[PDB]
């Protein structure tokens, strides 16, 4: 979160928190009412955000679901959508934490080692998160879509 790494920043520097750090912990907690509303929208829209998320993913990447693709059959396609439910969950954590620190140490650190070791095309799962982003930002206003989309594209950046 912004609270924990604004601390560990000033922790390492042998000092307390500046006004630049304490006027933002202050500014973040007054932002906390609006953050829970945004995460509350994505919380009980996972049925559509995931299922329509895998909608565009297969239309854009039919190789991964075609015979020979990693997510082929009734089995892998279920797990094919399971990971999108994971990453959609971590974005709800990042929105409430005000940072990608929850998304950092979960689903991002060493993610290329996992998916390379699973045979999954890491570029394909990046395409899946982008398809979820258009569904997510379509569910919110412009002021919110600059945030909810904002955490997806960070996940897109670290996932390639």
């Amino acid at each position: 979160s912004i609270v924990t790494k604004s601390i560990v920043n000033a922790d390492a520097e042998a000092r307390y928190l500046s006004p630049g750090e304490l006027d933002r912990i202050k500014s973040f907690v007054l932002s906390g009412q609006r953050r829970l509303r945004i995460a509350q929208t994505l919380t009980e829209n996972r049925e559509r955000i995931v299922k329509q998320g895998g909608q565009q993913l297969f239309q854009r990447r039919p190789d991964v679901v075609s015979p020979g693709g990693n997510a082929y059959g009734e089995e892998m396609t279920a797990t094919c959508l399971r990971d999108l439910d994971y990453y959609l969950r971590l974005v709800t954590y990042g929105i409430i934490a005000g940072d990608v620190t929850p998304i950092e140490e979960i689903g991002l650190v060493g993610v290329k080692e996992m998916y390379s070791a699973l045979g999954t095309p890491i570029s394909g799962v990046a395409e899946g998160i982008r398809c979820m982003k258009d569904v997510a930002c379509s569910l919110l206003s412009g002021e919110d879509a600059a945030e909810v989309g904002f955490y997806f594209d960070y996940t897109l950046a670290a996932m390639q």
Binding site: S1, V3, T4, I7, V8, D11, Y16, L17, L22, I25, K26, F28, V29, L30, G32, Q33, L36, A39, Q40, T43, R46, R89, T92, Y93, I96, A97, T101, P102, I106
Partner: protein
């Protein structure tokens, strides 16, 4: 190293579920006290040297640990104290902002009582210094903010015991 939001996200994540009404219920409780903690951490940063000067003069200034033979006699040993008391007043400020005492045992408590026994530092006088330091901290930040900052002082005193 988790704050109240990190601990709430961890417990809600460790079961693989979303942030339900109970998880957000505590998060709203933390955001309500977000205004109180910064002002508490504000004045403590200002009066850091004054608080430590008040605690040592009120608890262990004239006791015979201060005199020859006591545990605090030489100037290197005296100077180590206010250096040492600065961490307790500083890390307690971090716990007061993060709303979670995980940083204390992560960075202060572990190997601490095992270290003072090595040096021969009196744990009894140490806790009373922190207790007196907790008493002056309630003076500055007020009652409820002192209740918050005081809640992490005795956490140090408990584990250091």
């Amino acid at each position: 190293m988790q704050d109240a939001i990190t601990s709430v996200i961890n417990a809600a994540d460790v079961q693989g579920k979303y942030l339900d009404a109970n998880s957000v219920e505590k998060l709203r409780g933390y955001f309500q006290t977000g205004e109180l903690r910064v002002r508490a951490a504000a004045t403590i940063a200002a009066n850091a040297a004054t608080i430590i000067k008040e605690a040592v003069a009120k608890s262990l200034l004239y006791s015979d640990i201060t005199r020859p033979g006591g545990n605090m006699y030489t100037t290197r040993r005296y100077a180590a104290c206010i250096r040492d008391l600065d961490y307790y007043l500083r890390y307690a400020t971090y716990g007061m902002l993060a709303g979670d005492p995980s940083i204390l045992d992560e960075r202060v408590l572990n190997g601490l009582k095992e270290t003072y026994n090595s040096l021969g530092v009196p744990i009894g006088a140490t806790i009373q210094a922190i207790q007196a330091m907790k008493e002056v901290t309630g003076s500055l930040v007020g009652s409820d903010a002192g209740k918050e900052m005081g809640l992490y002082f005795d956490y140090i005193c408990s584990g250091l015991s």
